[PDB]
Design a protein around this ligand. Structure first.
Ligand SMILES: [Zn+2]
Lengths: 126, 394, 124, 114, 288, 190
RNA sequence: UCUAGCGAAACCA
RNA sequence: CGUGGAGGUCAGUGACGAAGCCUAGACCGUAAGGUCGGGUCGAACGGCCUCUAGUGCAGAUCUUGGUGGUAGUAGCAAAU
RNA sequence: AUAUUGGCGAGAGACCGAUAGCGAACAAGUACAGUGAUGGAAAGAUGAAAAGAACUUUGAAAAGAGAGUGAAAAAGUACGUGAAAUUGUUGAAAGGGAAGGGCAUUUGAUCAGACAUGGUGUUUUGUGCCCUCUGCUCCUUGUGGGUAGGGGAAUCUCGCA
């Protein structure tokens, strides 16, 4: 359990931390676990998701679907993946706001910041 | 992929040419290249069992007791491909006996009346150039059909067994050189019995019979309705003198997986309640989890280890099950896509699953990934499918 | 039967509620076109709306205007459903109160118009 | 035995109909045409807590509670609690008919299909 | 944006108000332009189409597909023979109440050569099937009542014919009907609607077999089974062939609703089709 | 210590004890022969004890001695009861020789009850079950009601009836001057 | 002066 | 007897529907009250042994809110 | 070493759960009132996602009606749940300047009202922890517990069917 005094376990404080979080903390919160293959690739379980990479959906009503992230809607703690949309009765399209805890990353978009992050997290990066 | 489907409601066969990903339920999906009706003979005489000899001929089982050899041709469909055209060459009739079946209609678990069917259609010999095939009835009639040198089917013998024979499995593992022909069969209060027949095909000998278990939790007699069976490799280690050297497994009606070691003896050393409340089970296929082909041509699981055995069964409802050697459910197979009681399932080449039943849907499933490969509407109740070679046209 | 029935609903209708209850009770159980002609005669002060509870017969105009507006609405909805006009008679009508402030007393008016049935002479 | 009840009706407050704000529970006032509760109406000790079936009721939440009525079947009767889900109610009914205990409220949240 | 209650409610209500103002003005302006030209009226109605669920159903190949071997199956699993009329057997379930007896009395007048029994304890269905075969009954009908309400129907064709379990949802008696009508001895015509799927054609051939053929043209009576959204509706009516070309009706006998729950091969042997709520959640298949 | 343990169990919290609406108490102690939680009844308050109790099929007499107050894993002694009812009651009287009347009497009673429960279970297993219980979810029930209403309102079935009757009429299917249609009206169709 | 529209409060075992 | 909260326990109940509401539905209590059915409903809640109290309402021309009649009346800047 | 209802931060609560708790959970010292000093409210909950009702039509406009989304509009930005007072319609009954209850009974309407269907003895045949022979295994080592193989009911006997 909670051993440090400087850690707190109040529900009210925790929700006030969660909903009032700044966006730089949110991309740390908006994290998705990698695949078994990507864990076999880099030796690492979960990562902060961004928009350029590719993912699959492992829960929800749209389970067993996949795609590249269109945009990360950090303000709603959510992430619009391309091609997973509800088509309205006008015919227009609106994506389902997914949540990265229910997602599994399939193909990473690797960058120098990303490669250095994998290196600092102990990754066996090729 | 080419498929031949015994279509009950037409009483016919249908040839299917379709590629991987063909789904008739969706217009956006791949459509099948060719659908061909053949040999439509009314619902009174639908195809029961087909045996493909390598390409040019097939073997048909009627509901009229008639076994039919059919010449198979190919002709250009006028993306290019050959379609197949069928011509019956020889027929042997009059192999059913419903008199014992209407005689035994009182002592019967099912509510409908009992009619005879060709449960088993297969060669007697693991070696090729056999030209000596068996036809088993529900009446216990085992017929020895020879392909003549004039290319004519000729029956050699018609021997009797006990009444209802739900299933009959041959033992094709080892020593094809010796003239020893082992099979097993069982049915409604008809125990699993191992019988050797003579290689001159004039006499059989019952070599073994199973024995029932002791009474249950309620101190009731356990009902005996075995439904299917496969063989494994015999016992390793020291043989015990005069028991037998045979190991094999079976599925009952009442959701029991029953394993049999003849070195152990006649009672089940292992019987497993697979499903609660004794749900009926229909078929029984064996498979490697990685889609490998580990069985005989008659499907006998080429191993000694019961724990390596993995099976796929169906109920009389819409369910397809996987189980280990211990009875733990490995999963349900295509449960969200079928809507009918899968009358027929089959492991083709280790890595494909033939499904077809009351759903009027032919479903090629993957064995390993458990993904549906092909869904086809056929407009008929399905009881038997053979799968030809994979073709990948365009 | 929902099939041989059209409906009209009005909400939050800023009218005197008591006068609307009287004029809705006056119109109940009538053929639609006869009731509309009656309401036209009300506007010419020819025939008056009899007052029973909240009281003699006045001619409250603002009630009758919204009433025949809803009657036109129900007639248009019946013709969009494709009903007979001549069989069409008002069957149910109900007024009740809308909330007071968003001192005034507005109301929710509703009515259901229904085709008159005709039976079949039996054969043998 | 022959259950005497001593009072069929209920005991209501004086002027309980005259006002909607006033409840119907018994509260002591602080003519004689109102029946007042008192210890003379207390039922016979053998007959007390008896159903018209002639049993004493017993609330049952699950099967382990039902097994406590195993010996006292003819005296007691099991009543399924109001908040039991319908998966458990059929299990309780099958177990009770196996035990041969009269369920006071069968067919609660349940129907018989086919 | 704004999270005050009274501010946000007011603002969105006024947005709704301005929107409906503009929509009324726009439809009125289009109405004026279509007073002028009747073309662009047609161009609008051809342009945009009102979406309904009847318009938009998931494509099924069972729709408009011919049945293979339909005549031999039709004589086989169904009683479709002008030479052989059906013996119909009413099988009201064990410990029945009064309500199912009343509904059976209703169902007497519907079905031809109908025979009622009161079931007794300890008769298994195989024994009953054997006795009905020896008495040459060709189909049995089981009324399932519960809580003094008829809830289920079961239809079994006797020469190893298929089992059908329908769920009855809503029932209306004759007396609660306003446009009452009095039914007569005359055999009605029959109406079947929207049975176009393969399973739907199977159920349509079922009801076509169970209902009496050969109607009385003199006594102008009809019954009807409409299919809508896997809900079939039973009613029955009397004819007025008007000069005005629209036939006149009077709903004679009782009405109710049925829904197929289970379609099984044989006498309760193997289930071809079942209903599930996970089937219901897709909301666009409509397995007929 | 047994009366101390008993007055702790009685006057304070016996975890197995269940309070009836009547006022009577009931131990959920699995070894308790009677259902009750009384002085003789609690197996926790008594060190000499006995109980007829069934494991999956076979019924066993369970004996509890004060000699094994410690070691509660090795506490209960098990005896397989005979399937002969008379012989098993004789076995009870043998193993409870020089034993009190309460345990022998209630133990015979519990044995009879469990054997008759076995008989009724064999009966119910052999008994045919046409109906099976289904509880209906209110979510499902509300979808059924509202979607039946939406289907009936959606399908104007009466107009489609009029349509198909005109279809059968104009199609033929009634002969020349049918008994359905008046002759003048049919000539207006003709 | 009438109709129409709007529309109280005092008080109320 | 009832109410909020607390310790222990019932490996208590619960999205196959908790709590709450309605119930010209049944039952048990002398009563305070309790139990179940049905309907509605959507996410928590109970029994027992104890502890603790902001713990039980018809009134106080009590407080606050809601709704009547008066009354379509008075009357027309009584607020617009 | 002490005080600290302020500041800057933390961490807790047998505290209150929107008439409570700060006046203020919300754009609260706000709107507003007062010339001013000052006084000072009311106001939380759609849904998992707005997917917030395309399109047709009535309609000045407000509001509708078809239609559709949604698991649920028995969730439609008046929105969780939705009590009472009070209102409208329909049905039933009563009344004619009738007030209420208590007891007791009819009449009318209405509801509940077996998943009850077994026991005892005898008999037929079959099966198994029944019989016989051959074992294995746990200790609480006994008035024990579990368990295997083959044979038999030809005879007996128990249980089951
Ligand atoms: Zn106790």
């Amino acid at each position: 359990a909670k051993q440090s005094l400087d850690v707190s376990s109040d529900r009210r404080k925790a929700r006030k931390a969660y909903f009032t979080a700044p966006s730089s903390q949110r991309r740390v919160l908006l994290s998705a676990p990698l695949s078994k293959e990507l864990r076999a690739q880099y030796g690492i379980k979960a990562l902060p998701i961004r928009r350029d990479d590719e993912v699959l959906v492992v829960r929800g009503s749209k389970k067993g679907q996949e795609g590249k992230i269109s945009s990360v809607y950090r303000l709603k703690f959510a992430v619009q993946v391309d091609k997973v949309t509800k088509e309205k009765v006008n015919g227009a399209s609106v994506p389902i706001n997914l949540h990265p805890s229910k997602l599994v990353i399939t193909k990473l978009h690797l960058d120098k910041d990303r490669k250095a992050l994998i290196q600092r997290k102990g990754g066996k990066l090729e | 992929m080419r498929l031949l489907v015994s279509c009950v409601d037409s009483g016919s066969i249908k040839e299917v040419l379709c590629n991987i990903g063909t789904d008739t339920s969706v217009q956006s999906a791949l459509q099948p290249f060719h659908v061909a009706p053949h040999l439509a003979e009314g619902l009174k005489a639908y195809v029961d069992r087909m045996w493909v000899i390598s390409e040019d001929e097939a073997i048909l089982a009627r509901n009229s007791g008639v076994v039919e050899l059919v010449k198979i041709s190919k002709h250009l469909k006028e993306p290019k491909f050959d379609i197949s055209e069928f011509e019956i060459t020889s027929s042997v009739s009059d192999l059913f006996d419903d008199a014992k079946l209407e005689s035994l209609s009182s002592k019967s678990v099912k509510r409908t009346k009992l009619v005879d069917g060709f449960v088993t259609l297969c060669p007697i010999k693991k070696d090729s150039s056999n030209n000596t095939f068996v036809a088993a009835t529900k009446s216990g009639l085992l017929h020895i059909i020879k392909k003549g040198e004039d290319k004519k089917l000729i029956k050699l013998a018609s021997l009797g067994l006990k009444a209802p024979v739900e299933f009959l499995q041959l033992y094709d593992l080892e020593d094809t050189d010796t003239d020893k022909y082992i099979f097993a069969y069982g049915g409604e209060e008809n125990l699993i019995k191992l019988v050797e027949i003579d290689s001159s095909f004039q006499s059989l000998k019952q070599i073994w019979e199973a024995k029932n278990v002791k009474n249950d939790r309620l101190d009731m007699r356990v009902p005996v309705w075995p439904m299917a069976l496969r063989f494994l490799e015999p016992s390793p280690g020291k043989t015990e003198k005069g028991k037998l050297n045979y190991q094999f497994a079976a599925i009952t009606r009442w959701s029991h997986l029953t394993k049999y070691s003849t070195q152990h003896g006649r009672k089940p050393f292992a019987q497993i309640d697979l499903l609660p409340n004794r749900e009926p089970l229909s078929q029984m296929e064996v498979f490697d989890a990685k889609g490998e082909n580990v069985v005989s041509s008659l499907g006998n699981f080429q191993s000694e280890t019961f724990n390596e055995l993995n099976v796929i069964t169906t109920d009389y409802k819409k369910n397809v099950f996987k189980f280990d050697g211990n009875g733990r459910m490995l999963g349900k197979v295509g449960r969200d896509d079928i809507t009918g009681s899968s009358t027929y399932i089959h492991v083709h080449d280790g890595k494909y699953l033939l499904q077809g039943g009351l759903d009027r849907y032919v479903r090629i499933f993957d064995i390993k990934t458990n993904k549906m490969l092909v869904k086809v509407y056929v407009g008929s109740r399905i009881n038997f499918i053979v799968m030809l070679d994979d073709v990948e046209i365009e | 039967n929902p099939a041989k029935s059209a409906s009209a609903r009005g909400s939050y209708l800023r009218v005197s509620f008591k006068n609307t209850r009287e004029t809705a009770q006056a119109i109940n159980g009538w053929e639609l076109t006869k009731a509309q002609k009656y309401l036209e005669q009300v506007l010419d002060h020819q025939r008056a709306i009899p007052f029973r509870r909240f009281n003699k017969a006045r001619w409250p105009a603002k009630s009758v205007k919204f009433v025949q507006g809803l009657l036109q609405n129900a007639a248009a909805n019946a013709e969009a459903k494709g009903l007979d006009a001549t069989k069409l008679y008002v069957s149910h009508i109900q007024v009740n109160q809308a909330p007071k402030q968003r001192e005034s007393s507005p109301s929710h008016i509703e009515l259901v118009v229904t085709e008159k049935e005709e039976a079949v002479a039996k054969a043998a | 035995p022959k259950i005497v009840k001593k009072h069929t009706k209920k005991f209501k407050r004086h002027h309980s109909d005259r006002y909607h704000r006033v409840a119907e529970n018994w509260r002591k006032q602080k003519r004689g045409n109102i029946s007042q509760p008192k210890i003379g109406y207390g039922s016979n000790k053998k007959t007390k807590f008896l159903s018209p079936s002639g049993h004493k009721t017993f609330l049952v939440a699950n099967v382990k509670d039902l097994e406590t009525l195993t010996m006292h079947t003819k005296t007691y009767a099991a009543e399924i609690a109001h908040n039991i889900s319908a998966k458990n109610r059929v299990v309780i009914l099958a177990r009770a008919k196996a035990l041969g205990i009269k369920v006071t409220n069968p067919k609660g949240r349940l129907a018989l299909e086919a | 944006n704004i999270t005050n209650k009274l501010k946000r409610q007011e603002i969105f209500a006024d947005i709704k108000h301005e929107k409906n103002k503009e929509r009324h003005t726009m439809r009125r302006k289009r109405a004026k332009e279509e007073r002028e030209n009747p073309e662009l009226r047609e161009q609008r109605l051809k342009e945009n189409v009102t979406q309904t669920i009847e318009n938009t159903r998931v494509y099924d190949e069972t729709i408009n597909k011919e049945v293979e071997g339909d005549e031999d199956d039709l004589m086989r699993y169904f009683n479709s023979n002008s030479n052989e009329p059906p013996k119909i057997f009413l099988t009201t379930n064990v410990n029945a109440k009064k309500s199912a007896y009343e509904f059976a009395n209703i169902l007497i007048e519907i079905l031809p050569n109908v025979t009622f029994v009161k079931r007794k304890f300890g008769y298994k269905l195989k024994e009953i099937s054997d006795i009905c075969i020896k008495r040459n009954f060709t189909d049995i009908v089981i009324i399932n009542e519960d809580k003094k309400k008829v809830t289920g129907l079961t239809f079994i064709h006797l020469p190893e014919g298929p089992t059908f379990y329908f769920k009855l949802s809503s029932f209306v008696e004759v007396k609660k009907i306003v446009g009452h009508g009095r039914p007569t001895s005359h055999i009605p015509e029959l109406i079947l609607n929207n049975f176009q799927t393969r399973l739907g054609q199977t159920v349509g051939r079922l009801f076509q077999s169970i209902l009496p053929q050969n109607p009385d043209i003199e006594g102008r009576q009809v019954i009807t089974l409409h299919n809508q959204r896997d809900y079939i509706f039973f009613r029955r009516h009397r004819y007025v062939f008007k000069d005005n070309e629209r036939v006149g009706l009077q709903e004679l006998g009782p009405q109710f609703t049925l829904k197929l729950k289970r379609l099984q091969r044989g006498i309760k042997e193997e289930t071809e089709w079942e209903h599930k709520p996970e089937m219901d959640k897709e909301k666009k298949k409509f397995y007929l | 210590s047994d009366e101390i343990v008993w007055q702790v169990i009685n006057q304070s919290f016996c975890s197995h004890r269940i309070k009836a609406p009547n006022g009577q108490n009931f131990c959920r102690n699995e070894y308790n022969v009677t259902g009750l939680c009384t002085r003789q009844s609690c197996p926790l308050a008594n060190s000499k004890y006995a109980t007829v109790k069934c494991d999956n099929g076979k019924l066993y007499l369970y004996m509890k001695t004060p000699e094994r107050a410690h070691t509660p894993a090795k506490l209960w002694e098990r005896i397989k009861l005979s399937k002969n009812y008379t012989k098993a009651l004789q076995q009870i009287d043998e193993h409870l020789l020089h034993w009190s009347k309460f345990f022998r009497h209630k133990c015979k009673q519990r044995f009879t009850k469990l054997t008759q429960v076995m008989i009724t279970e064999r009966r119910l297993a052999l008994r045919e079950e046409e109906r099976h219980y289904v509880g209906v979810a209110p979510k499902v029930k509300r979808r059924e009601q509202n979607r039946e209403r939406k289907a009936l309102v959606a399908a104007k079935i009466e107009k489609a009836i009029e349509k198909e009757l005109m279809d059968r009429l104009k199609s033929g299917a009634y002969g020349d001057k049918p008994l359905n249609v008046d002759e003048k009206v049919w000539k207006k169709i003709m």
